[PDB]
């Protein structure tokens, strides 16, 4: 189906403990494929997925040089942002950026993304038109004016419609046996007595990729949204993800409950029930 490339940048100041740390990670869908960390003994863009290792030295040199330039620019930005908010030099602050592109099954651009946050609060974002910005406050308006003067949006549009989509298509082909393989969830229902009166039914989904999934409990065919405990989808460490959904049911009523599972790896959506 559809696919995405994303880069995630985090810069963190730490007054009295050196210059701000800069970390960058790159993802295709739910698969990390590169990392950079300015605190590494020899900072350099490093592979994190087997299909990126075939890129030659020119690739790693370029990506490392971009990361080191970004490290310096983000240190400058953190100094500027401290001033825009009249903040003390004594505090630690965070600047985050996430950008990239979404493509459809035919490889055509669906849309581009470029968004930034300061201390966890949305700061400035490129609009979907890839030509204008939305600034959160009067500080972000300073950044917007600087980027408008330098025609930053036109550079981002060129990148997102060009290199971003071209390289995403390249990665998708080089990694097609994993990036273009949906692994369906392995599913089962467990039963956990609580008391004489109630038991927990827990619907499990294990070993699936990508992370996108829908797990729902129905009682007599009605969704139990408010009554379902749904844990956050979590990584297993082997590419795949795990999730479960639980409902508390009166003893003897277990067969009125059904678990419903949707995932792109499944040939058809699943309906499960407790099978004692």
């Amino acid at each position: 189906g559809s696919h995405s490339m994303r880069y995630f940048y985090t810069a963190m100041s730490r007054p009295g403990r050196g210059e701000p740390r800069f970390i960058a990670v790159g993802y295709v869908d739910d698969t990390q494929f590169v990392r950079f960390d300015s605190d590494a003994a020899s900072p350099r863009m490093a592979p994190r997925a087997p299909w990126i290792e075939q890129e030659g030295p020119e690739y790693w040199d370029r990506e490392t040089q971009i990361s080191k330039t970004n490290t310096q620019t983000y240190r400058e930005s953190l100094r500027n942002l401290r001033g825009y908010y009249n903040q003390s030099e004594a505090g630690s602050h965070t600047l985050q950026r996430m950008y990239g592109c979404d493509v459809g099954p035919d490889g055509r651009l669906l849309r581009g993304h470029d968004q930034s946050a300061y201390d966890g609060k949305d700061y400035i974002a490129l609009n979907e038109d890839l030509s204008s910005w939305t600034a959160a406050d009067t500080a972000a308006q300073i950044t917007q004016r600087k980027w408008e003067a330098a025609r930053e949006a036109e550079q981002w549009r060129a990148y997102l419609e060009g290199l971003c989509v071209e390289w995403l298509r390249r990665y998708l082909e080089n990694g097609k046996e994993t990036l273009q393989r949906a692994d369906p969830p392995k599913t089962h229902v467990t039963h956990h007595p609580i008391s004489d009166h109630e038991a927990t039914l827990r619907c499990w989904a294990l070993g699936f990729y990508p992370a996108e999934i829908t797990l729902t409990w129905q009682r007599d065919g009605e969704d139990q949204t408010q009554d379902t405990e749904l844990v956050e989808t979590r990584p297993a460490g082997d590419r795949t993800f795990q999730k479960w959904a639980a409902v508390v049911v009166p003893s003897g009523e277990e067969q009125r409950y059904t678990c419903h599972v949707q995932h792109e790896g499944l040939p058809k959506p699943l309906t499960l029930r407790w099978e004692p």
Partner: peptide
Amino acid sequence: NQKLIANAF
């Protein structure tokens, strides 16, 4: 493939 980010905030 990353973008080169040269304009500070």
